């Protein structure tokens, strides 16, 4: 099937577990990193294989194959571009408004495909969203993906609760995309005015506090504000699903202007 002989692979550098290399082309190989796979680890790796084998989208990191000989590794596509966490604040790229909606629409369309194929990516942050080449967006790792701790900024108040730690519904992914959208829009990070992860996750987990919503840009329309508000809500009983969120983002992209200053006739000849 997708099993690939271990002899026909090359591992160039350790820049990720994940090993940059070549396999009929530049690929990414995620070695297990433990010599012995305990039955639970093997179970997790076959869940990873099964969850990756059902995703084929132009907005999802491509799955190339898995090697099970002497180690467990999943061969995935290699993308030449930052993980969008750098572009957020570390690299400070400062995209324009018209290019700042396309990323949101592409992330929504990929998440749409994931949810349509009954795939829940579970937790996701700005790092897993790879801005590969010319603004194209690729969804990253599926480590927590299941078919039905360092950073707590991009993860749902229900998801911390886990009174039974059984349930994971689509609204968790909805808020994950909404918080990604908020970070993408304002280019900043809430809860960054202070340095107490325990306190911020206590206040946001139990509904004491909400992410601030006033750091957004003067240029963004009122409809974007309503969409982001409907994304970031405390209660997710009927948090609006990904089909209608993609419809709303497409409608708003249609109505947006793509220049900042009125442009006259260009130079003749």
């Amino acid at each position: 099937d997708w099993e690939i002989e271990a002899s026909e692979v090359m591992l160039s550098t350790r820049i990720g577990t994940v090993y940059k290399g070549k396999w009929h082309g530049d690929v990414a190989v995620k070695i297990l990193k433990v010599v012995d796979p305990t039955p639970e680890q093997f179970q997790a790796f076959r869940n990873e294989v099964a969850v990756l084998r059902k995703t084929r989208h132009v907005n999802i990191l491509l799955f190339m194959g898995y090697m099970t000989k002497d180690n467990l590794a999943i061969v995935t596509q290699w993308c030449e571009g930052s993980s969008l966490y750098k572009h957020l604040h570390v690299q400070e790229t400062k995209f324009q408004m018209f290019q700042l909606i396309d990323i949101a629409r592409q992330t929504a369309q990929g998440m749409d495909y994931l949810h349509a194929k009954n795939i829940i990516h579970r937790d996701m942050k700005s790092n897993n969203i790879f801005l590969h080449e010319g603004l194209t967006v690729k969804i990253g790792d599926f480590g927590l993906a299941t078919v039905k701790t360092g950073s707590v900024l991009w993860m749902a108040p229900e998801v911390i609760r886990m009174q039974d730690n059984n349930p994971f519904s689509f609204q968790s992914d909805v808020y994950s995309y909404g918080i990604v959208l908020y970070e993408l829009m304002t280019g900043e990070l809430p809860y960054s005015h202070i340095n107490n992860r325990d306190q911020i996750i206590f206040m946001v987990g139990r509904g004491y506090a909400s992410p601030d919503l006033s750091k957004l840009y003067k240029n963004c329309p009122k409809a974007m504000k309503r969409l982001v508000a409907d994304c970031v809500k405390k209660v997710k009983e009927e948090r609006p699903l990904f089909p209608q969120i993609l419809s709303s983002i497409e409608l708003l992209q249609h109505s947006l202007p793509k220049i900042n200053r009125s442009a006259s006739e260009p130079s003749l000849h």
């Binding site: 220049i259 442009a263 130079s267």
Partner: protein, 228 residues
């Protein structure tokens, strides 16, 4: 006999990225005193547009730096005044040339609408920086010059034509930016767009290809004005 030589020097200066020499050659070729063709007319337009646009971009950046805050404020003021002097000199040069040798001798409506549009343009560039009574006067001249070209365009000039579309685009951007009356600008852009779409079907490949650019700029400006 020298007309080909001057147009050749203008083309060489365009290729060499030195617009001032091509503008000077263009000035001589018109001051000679014969009827101009489309090629030399467009060479004049592009040369003067390039030099004035460089000056205007420099003035815009100068004003943007001046906006922020102590002797730097007055230093930026003097720099803006110098750039204003250069801009006024070039604009008055082209306006006087248009008034004396070009519009009066213009024979065909296509030429008349092009020269009137150019005059309205450069009066708009003057108004963009001019203040007070001079601003009011140049605004009046700008509006009169375009309106006349608009009349000739509606009377004779084709409705899919790139010059008519460009006249509509420039008239609308003048209405929006200078006259501070976005309603008229939006209306004018809308009727121009509607007429062009009405006669879009019969367009040839090349005519479609140049017209669609001004069409797209009309759409972008209309979206920018309609949006909050």
């Amino acid at each position: 006999v020298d007309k080909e030589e001057l147009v050749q020097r203008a083309k060489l200066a365009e290729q060499a990225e030195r617009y001032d020499d091509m503008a000077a050659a263009m000035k001589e070729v018109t001051e000679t005193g014969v009827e101009l063709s489309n090629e030399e007319r467009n060479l004049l337009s592009v040369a003067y547009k390039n030099v004035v646009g460089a000056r205007r971009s420099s003035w815009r950046v100068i004003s943007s730096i001046e906006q922020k805050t102590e002797r730097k404020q007055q230093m930026a003021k003097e720099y803006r005044v110098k750039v204003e002097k250069e801009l006024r000199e070039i604009c008055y040069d082209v306006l006087g040339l248009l008034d004396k040798h070009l519009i009066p001798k213009a024979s065909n409506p296509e030429s008349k609408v092009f020269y009137l549009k150019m005059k309205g343009d450069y009066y708009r560039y003057l108004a963009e920086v001019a203040t007070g009574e001079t601003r009011n006067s140049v605004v009046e001249d700008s509006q009169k010059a375009y309106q006349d070209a608009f009349e000739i365009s509606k009377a004779k000039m084709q409705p899919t034509h790139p010059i008519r579309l460009g006249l509509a685009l420039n008239f609308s951007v003048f209405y929006y930016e200078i006259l501070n009356s976005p309603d008229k600008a939006c209306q004018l852009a809308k009727q121009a767009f509607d007429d062009a779409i009405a006669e879009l079907d019969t367009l040839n490949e090349d005519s479609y290809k140049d017209s669609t650019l001004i069409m797209q700029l009309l759409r972008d400006n209309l979206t920018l004005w309609t949006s909050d």
